[PDB]
Enzyme design. Sequence first.
Site, PDB file in Angstrom:
ATOM      1  CD  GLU A  44      -3.216  -0.724   2.018  1.00 30.36           C
ATOM      2  OE1 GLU A  44      -3.356   0.279   2.582  1.00 30.36           O
ATOM      3  OE2 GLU A  44      -4.247  -1.833   1.718  1.00 30.36           O
ATOM      4  CG  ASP A  73      -6.583   1.406   1.087  1.00 29.47           C
ATOM      5  OD1 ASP A  73      -6.468   1.475   2.302  1.00 29.47           O
ATOM      6  OD2 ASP A  73      -6.540   0.360   0.616  1.00 29.47           O
ATOM      7  CG  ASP A  89     -10.362  -0.680  -0.013  1.00 26.99           C
ATOM      8  OD1 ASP A  89      -9.723   0.371   0.544  1.00 26.99           O
ATOM      9  OD2 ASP A  89     -11.148  -1.180   0.269  1.00 26.99           O
ATOM     10  CE  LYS A  91     -10.237  -4.329   0.422  1.00 31.44           C
ATOM     11  NZ  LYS A  91      -9.990  -4.241   2.070  1.00 31.44           N
TER      12      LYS A  91
HETATM   13 MN   LIG Z   1      -5.196   1.236   3.762  1.00 31.75          MN
HETATM   14 MN   LIG Z   2      -6.062  -1.615   1.852  1.00 32.09          MN
END
Ligand SMILES: [Mn+2]
Ligand SMILES: [Mn+2]
Lengths: 244, 238
Positions: A44, A73, A89, A91
């Site tokens: 991330e 995110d 987002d 993952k």
């Molecule tokens: Mn995050």
């Molecule tokens: Mn995330």
Amino acid sequence: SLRSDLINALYDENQKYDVCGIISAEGKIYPLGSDTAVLSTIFELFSRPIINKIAEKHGYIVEEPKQQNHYPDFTLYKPSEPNKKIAIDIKTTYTNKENEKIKFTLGGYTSFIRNNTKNIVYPFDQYIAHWIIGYVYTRVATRKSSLKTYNINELNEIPKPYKGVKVFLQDKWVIAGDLAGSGNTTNIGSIHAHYKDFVEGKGIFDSEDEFLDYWRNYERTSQLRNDKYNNISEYRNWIYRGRK
Amino acid sequence: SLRSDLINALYDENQKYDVCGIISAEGKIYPLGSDTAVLSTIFELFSRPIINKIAEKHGYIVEEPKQQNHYPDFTLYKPSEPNKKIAIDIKTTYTNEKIKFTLGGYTSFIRNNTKNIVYPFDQYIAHWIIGYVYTRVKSSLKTYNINELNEIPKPYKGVKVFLQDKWVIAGDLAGSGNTTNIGSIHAHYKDFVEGKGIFDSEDEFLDYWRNYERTSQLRNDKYNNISEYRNWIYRGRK
DNA sequence: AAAGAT
DNA sequence: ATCTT
DNA sequence: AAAGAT
DNA sequence: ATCTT
Ligand SMILES: [Mn+2]
Ligand SMILES: [Mn+2]
Ligand SMILES: [Mn+2]
Ligand SMILES: [Mn+2]
Ligand SMILES: [Mn+2]
Ligand SMILES: [Mn+2]
Ligand SMILES: [Mn+2]
Ligand SMILES: [Mn+2]
Ligand SMILES: [Mn+2]
């Protein structure tokens, strides 16, 4: 488009650079440990500048949650299109042997998909797209050289707890599956398939509306789902009969 | 001792270095974000070399879980005394002021000797918590090179660290709901360092959390806090 | 706080 | 946030 | 997998 | 693993 430029840049950066540790302002480097806990944080952070750069090249504002526990995110949007916001987002998951089937946890099915302003940075109905940047890596057991610190001149002598990283960008509804991703924290489960199936969008739902209706009416336990539906075939039968 | 040399090294390292980003083999640095997950991960990685250095000085082997979702972060044991392991787990929380930590589950290894734990729970003779506390703190969405380390903005300030026994700082109110965690006392940093807790003993701490029910409905006919647990004990554990 | 969010 | 059994 | 672990 | 409401 914003989307194709974004995945091209993430795919390229992933191919070029490997993260190998955390660094202190004093220049000392600490190696990476083993779990997806550590790797999910690392991928991330790796993604942040890339997403910002491409979003800016396109005229989008990038906003990360100001509050904890809030999806997504990254929120992207043009001031001129307040109601066409894009949620991204990140993952991550792992594989023990390269290329076996994988699955991701796609976040709750009882927060913002059932309550327009619950655990989300902007009301759910202001977003027109929800994208998942999925990272997969193959585990590599930690070595007894991972437990020392390093200086910058040793950067590429640092052992890594991973190999074979792959990245994709796909719509959440497209890769969503029909089985929960977690129990006590009620997560939507993605399909359980090969990395290429995520890239190609070979999921189980026929439309985003179907994905939403399914997860908005999915009960929390097998018991609570006994007289309703537990998978897509059961859900389509339930729809056929009149939601009963 | 191992414990005193560890407290001292942890304090010292925390004092000398400030983590500010992740670095790629190519030398590009990516700043830290503010997600809770970020800080938890960074402090754990930061502690790893410190813990292994002191453990080796004392003849202890250090073992991290070879399986995910298993306690503790670090298992220490001298080769000769295997049945005498030391569990060390790292925990983090923030301030802006009293603090509280989530100290791990109350329904796993404390109720089942081999559940979610690297070695059988009965092989550990001590359970230590290394607690990190920091103050939470922009377009820090760009990369940096080594010559710019000092200009990278941080999502934290004022990090403090302590090492204390888990039972000593444990409280009587759950630290989380659906993930059934033991909650620590809600107190000032100083109280954690000094060990100003609520349990009279490790035995009381364990018994309390081994018999704590998961919901208020269930707890309201048994006990919800330490006073009520002591009364439950007097009633004959019913 | 209890309960349920990432 | 994602993983184990 | 479901349910409950970090 | 820990935070919010
Ligand atoms: Mn995050
Ligand atoms: Mn995330
Ligand atoms: Mn599988
Ligand atoms: Mn909110
Ligand atoms: Mn396939
Ligand atoms: Mn850990
Ligand atoms: Mn920990
Ligand atoms: Mn196990
Ligand atoms: Mn105090």
